[PDB]
Amino acid sequence: SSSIPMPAGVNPADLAAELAAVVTESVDEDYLLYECDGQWVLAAGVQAMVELDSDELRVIRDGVTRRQQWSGRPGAALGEAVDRLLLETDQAFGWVAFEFGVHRYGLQQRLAPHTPLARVFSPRTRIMVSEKEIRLFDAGIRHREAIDRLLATGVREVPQSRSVDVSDDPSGFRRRVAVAVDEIAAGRYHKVILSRCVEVPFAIDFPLTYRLGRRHNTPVRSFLLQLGGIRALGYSPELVTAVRADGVVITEPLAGGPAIDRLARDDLESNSKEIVEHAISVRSSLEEITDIAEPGSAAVIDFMTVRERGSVQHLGSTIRARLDPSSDRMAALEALFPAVTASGIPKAAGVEAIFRLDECPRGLYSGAVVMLSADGGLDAALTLRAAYQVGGRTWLRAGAGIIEESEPEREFEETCEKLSTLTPYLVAR
Ligand SMILES: N#Cc1cccc(-c2ccc(C(=O)O)o2)c1
């Protein structure tokens, strides 16, 4: 492990995104950049890839693909493969699809064959960028020379963004919300999150868009990736699960000018509908975390407080527990996935309603971006406020929590508001 001092007057997010863009392009390698607690970790190059699909598990290393049949819990299949990765490298990175969370509710038969559940890789090199320093892990000579060449120059100018039209409704979001409202009125479930894709008619420069959007937002976590033909970036508004080496498990569900921002904060703390849903959600997180925790260790340590994320303020709680010796970090992720914010209440009913009333598979949207460590660590950020590119198609995706009182026009405008997090910050390629 070697170190380079962080150059003064340079923002870590900008430098990490520039390294991700230029260093990985010169050697033509895949990567994942993950921001977590002031640290930007760039996982560059694929030493080994774990592909978990609905019908198969693959481990691809040095041109060789090992295929495996799997049965039971997807977390057990993923965990066993990722633990083997972590015996050779200190950290592993990737993404978990929304579809990974359907098995706990017995809904996996509704998945088409070859449905992606997770993609986790061990990188060839890691570059950690923070305000204090740049730390290099397993960086070969060719990579160290590329990093020094990038550092001898200033970061690129971020060009002006290109606007996107989000006013159209080709997937019939308004109609699908009306169906959900009728189902809720009939007592089938209490809440469901429905969403819509918005096609971007031009190719996006992902690392430059990442930089422009990160200037205005201070999210819980962020990511930028180019992995297995998928380009993605996002500003995670929620921590699904964090597992520490000492056994502490955390989950932080959310639920919700200077004078205008203070008035919005006062409403966020007094809104009855938001308070009721938050209490139900906190109770759901507590019941779920108790199935993997040491008896009597589950507790709410921060209850209903505002967290400022720069351009967005959230009402949230922190649920903590100690991981039971009979459980593991993948079981903890399975117990807390999918998030209530990504599914609905009751969670099983919300997930089932999403199969019928949303464009499926969701893939990365409402899934998680993850960082795992050899000492047992896990960090999983909820994937919302994200942009994607897969084989010629570039798109955004945003949803809304639909309840009995929801109105289709109001909820369409609510997805328009969530889309505003990225739409003015899209840099064209
Ligand atoms: N319940 C609930 C809830 C609270 C906050 C956000 C969301 C939600 C659903 C989908 C999205 C999004 O796409 O950003 O955000 C859902």
Numbering used by the authors: 15 to 270, 277 to 449
Give the exact sentences the study uses for this entry.
The salicylate synthase MbtI from Mycobacterium tuberculosis (Mtb, the etiological agent of TB) is the first enzyme involved in the biosynthesis of mycobactins. These small-molecule siderophores are capable of chelating iron, a key cofactor involved in several mycobacterium-specific biological processes. MbtI has been structurally and biochemically characterized;2 it is essential for the survival of Mtb under iron-deficient conditions, and, as such, it has been identified as a promising therapeutic target. MbtI belongs to the group of structurally homologous Mg2+-dependent menaquinone, siderophore, and tryptophan (MST) enzymes, which transform chorismate by rearrangement, to generate precursor molecules for the respective biosynthetic pathways.
A kinetic analysis confirmed 10 as a competitive inhibitor of MbtI, with a Ki value of 4.2 ± 0.8 μM. In the complex MbtI-10, the enzyme conformation can be defined as an open state for the ensemble of the four molecules in the asymmetric unit (ASU), despite the partially incomplete electron density of the mobile loops (unresolved regions for chain A: 271–276; chain B: 270–290 and 328–334; chain C: 275–282; chain D: 274–277). The adoption of this conformation is due to the fact that 10 does not possess a suitable functional group in the correct orientation to establish a H-bond with Gly270 or Thr271. Finally, the cyano group forms a H-bond with Lys205, a key amino acid involved in the first step of the catalytic reaction. Despite our experiments were carried out in the presence or in the absence of Mg2+ in the crystallization buffer (2–5 mM of different Mg2+ salts), we never observed any bound Mg2+ in the MbtI-10 cocrystal structure. The main differences are related to the orientation of the side chain of Arg405, which was not predicted to interact with the ligand and the side chains of Thr271 and His334, which are shifted away from the binding site. As previously mentioned, the absence of interactions between the ligand with the amide group of Gly270 or the hydroxyl group of Thr271 seems to favor the outward movement of the backbone in the two mobile loops, thereby leading to an open conformation. The MbtI-10 structure highlighted a new mode of ligand–protein interaction in which the binding of the ion is not a key feature for the development of improved inhibitors.
